[PDB]
């Protein structure tokens, strides 16, 4: 429905994973870890960030229903990406995804003979898992991403290519590092992204002639008290993430 995949804070704390004794902080790592695995595979498999993001969202929702203690991120992530790639028009072959997921989780090991049975199984497992992801998501595989609205947000502030790129950066990273995709609609997340991208670049946008703030043309429900509340949380976890801010840090 319209609110089936959006949760409260009280709901995120009482996650399926919490119910099996996984601390609140570990669940978050577990998520981030899956995100990273998706990104690493996604780049080797030569698919788009759009696909990777769709996969990351599948993974997020999936773990609002299933628990990490029954489905390990390193199993779900590849199946999730296998699915996203089909959905977003960039299908990758089942054997191709297994191949890549392997060298990602086992940089050292060598790929079993694609004739063995221990391989024929890990192929059946992926397929099985993709089925479980579909059923879990109830076949809602059409995902809206904050990125879509970033153009529309940054078009307003007439920001440089630079503030734009940075805003997308914030977008993608919010998917990796936070559970925003589970709490706030894309257009709101998009605002949070631009807002923080501005703070970071020191960019300041003047109030318009109407007297309205830049973000009211984006979502009726967005308020400065929220943007500051969110961009703080987002910035915090970005500071905890090694080498991440460096990518948008002005070194001049």
């Amino acid at each position: 429905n319209n609110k089936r995949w959006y949760f409260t804070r009280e709901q995120l704390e009482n996650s399926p994973s919490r119910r099996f004794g996984v601390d609140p902080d570990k669940e978050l790592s577990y998520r981030q870890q899956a995100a990273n695995l998706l990104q690493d595979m996604g780049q080797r498999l030569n698919v788009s960030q759009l696909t990777i993001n769709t996969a990351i969202v599948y993974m997020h929702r999936f773990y609002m229903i299933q628990s990490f203690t029954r489905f390990p991120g390193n199993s779900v992530a590849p199946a999730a990406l296998f699915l996203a790639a089909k959905v977003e028009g960039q299908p990758k072959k089942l054997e191709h995804v297994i191949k890549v997921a392997h060298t990602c989780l086992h940089p050292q090991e060598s790929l079993p003979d694609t004739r063995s049975e221990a391989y024929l199984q890990q192929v059946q497992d992926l397929v099985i898992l993709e089925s479980i992801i579909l059923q879990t998501l109830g076949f809602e595989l059409t995902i809206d991403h904050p990125h879509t609205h970033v153009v529309k947000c940054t078009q307003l502030v007439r920001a440089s290519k630079d503030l734009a790129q940075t805003s997308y950066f914030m977008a993608t990273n919010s998917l990796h590092l936070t559970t925003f995709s589970l709490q706030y609609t894309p257009p709101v997340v998009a605002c949070v992204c631009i807002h923080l991208a501005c703070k970071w670049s020191n960019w300041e946008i003047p109030v318009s002639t109407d007297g309205k703030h830049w973000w009211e043309y984006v979502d009726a429900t967005v308020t400065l008290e929220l943007l500051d509340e969110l961009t703080h949380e987002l910035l915090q976890i970005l500071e905890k993430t090694p080498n991440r801010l460096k990518r948008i840090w002005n070194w001049r």
């Binding site: 089936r4 399926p16 229903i65 299933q66 029954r70 296998f82 699915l83 089909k86 959905v87 299908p91 072959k93 089942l94 992926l126 397929v127 993709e130 089925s131 479980i132 579909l134 059923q135 879990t136 998501l137 109830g138 076949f139 809602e140 595989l141 059409t142």
Partner: protein, 305 residues
């Protein structure tokens, strides 16, 4: 393993195949608790070696988007392992009706049918979807007399380095000239061609251009709509398959004449002629056809009984 958003299809009591002959494996079924009638399409997994079929993902994507009085309605998706698409049930298919001899259509009812059909097409096109499988058999009608377009199996989104859409689409009999001349940059106008054939079928009770091969199809189309001259269809040259294979040369348009006997109504014939136009860029669109004097003269479009 938990599953709050995908019910076991066992909640539906199967009844009868309706049917495999329509290109899909479809059952009628009854909600064990409410009696609600539904159609279950199984997702066929024979010869599928790449997980859940990308084909079925398209269809489900499209149906979840297409919500409209004249488009079949996906209610939910069910499991059991196997996966089922579940629709609101449609008692009739326009082909079963047209072949049944005890069934009889008044001009006003036919108006209504075409209206719904064309209105349904307007919606999907507006939503950037091509049906690509127009045929009487794919036009359903509910017991309360509402028409629904169905079977979005070969369906596909379209948009605007020309396009490279699949060319092997549309049943041969309802396939337009563009696709027989090997076109790969098409759009809405193809579905409307089918709308044409279907409309004609409404008086002739039988598909009007039943070819054996693609060259035989283009053959029949010319004997009815005229030859494929750049006089009629500007730039029909650039198509390699143009001269490469047959075609005629002396054919003059016999659409109105050949159908005259069956159709009768002048406005009816007039609309059929603008639907069965050779050049897609000149073939009437769904908006203008809904506005054609056919639907705004007597008798007026009436409900179905």
């Amino acid at each position: 393993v938990e599953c709050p958003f995908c019910d076991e299809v066992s909640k539906y009591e199967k009844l009868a195949k309706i049917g495999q002959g329509t290109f899909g494996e479809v059952f009628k079924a009854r909600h064990r608790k409410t009696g609600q009638k539904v159609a279950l399409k199984k997702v066929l997994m024979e010869n599928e070696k790449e997980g859940f079929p990308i084909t079925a993902l398209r269809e489900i994507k499209i149906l979840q988007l297409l919500k409209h009085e004249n488009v079949v309605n996906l209610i939910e998706i069910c499991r059991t392992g196997s996966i089922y698409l579940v629709f609101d049930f449609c008692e009739h298919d326009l082909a079963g009706l047209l072949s049944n001899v005890l069934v009889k259509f008044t001009l006003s009812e036919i108006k209504r049918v075409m209206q719904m059909l064309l209105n349904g097409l307007y919606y999907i096109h507006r939503n950037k979807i091509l049906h690509r499988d127009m045929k009487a058999a794919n036009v359903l009608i509910t017991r309360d007399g509402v028409l629904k377009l169905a079977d979005f199996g070969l369906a596909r989104a379209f948009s605007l380095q020309p396009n490279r859409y699949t060319n092997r689409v549309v049943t041969l009999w309802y396939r337009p000239p563009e696709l027989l001349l090997g076109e790969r940059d098409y759009g809405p106008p193809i579905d409307l061609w089918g709308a044409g054939c279907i409309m004609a079928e409404m008086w002739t009770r039988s598909p009007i251009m039943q070819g054996n091969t693609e060259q035989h199809q283009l053959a029949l189309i010319s004997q009815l709509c005229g030859s494929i001259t750049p006089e009629v269809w500007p730039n029909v040259d650039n198509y390699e398959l143009y001269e490469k294979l047959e075609l005629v040369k002396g054919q003059k348009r016999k659409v109105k004449d050949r159908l005259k006997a069956y159709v009768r109504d002048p406005y009816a014939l007039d609309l059929i002629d603008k639907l069965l136009v050779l050049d897609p860029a000149q073939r009437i669109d769904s908006d203008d056809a809904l506005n054609h004097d056919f639907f705004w003269s007597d008798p007026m479009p009436s409900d179905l009984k």
